């Protein structure tokens, strides 16, 4: 699998890395998330794409973010 989900869809996906922080970029701006689900997550619903200059787009300290339910959770189901 490697389709975004439809809206109304589940958001199913295998977390291999819920602690890998990630600077991502889109509809909202740049922030950090937690998480590879939330990554995809970001992509699907923000257009958020993982920056190329993270510590440009987010803050020099974005790798040691603590990761919270926040930046981290992803809604079950495709808005
Ligand atoms: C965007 O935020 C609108 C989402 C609407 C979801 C609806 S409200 C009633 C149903 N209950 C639920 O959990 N989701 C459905």
């Known amino acids: 699998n490697y ?3 439809n809206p109304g869809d589940a958001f ?3 977390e291999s890395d819920a602690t890998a922080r990630f600077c991502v970029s889109g509809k909202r701006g740049a922030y950090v998330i937690c998480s590879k689900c939330r990554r995809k ?3 699907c619903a923000n ?4 920056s190329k200059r993270p510590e440009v787009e987010c803050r020099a300290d974005w790798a040691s973010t603590e990761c ?3 930046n981290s ?4 189901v495709m808005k």
């Open 41 to 43: 997550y970001e992509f």
């Open 3 to 5: 389709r975004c989900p």
């Open 12 to 14: 199913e996906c295998f």
């Open 73 to 76: 959770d992803v809604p079950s």
């Open 47 to 50: 257009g958020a794409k993982v």
């Open 68 to 70: 919270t339910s926040e």
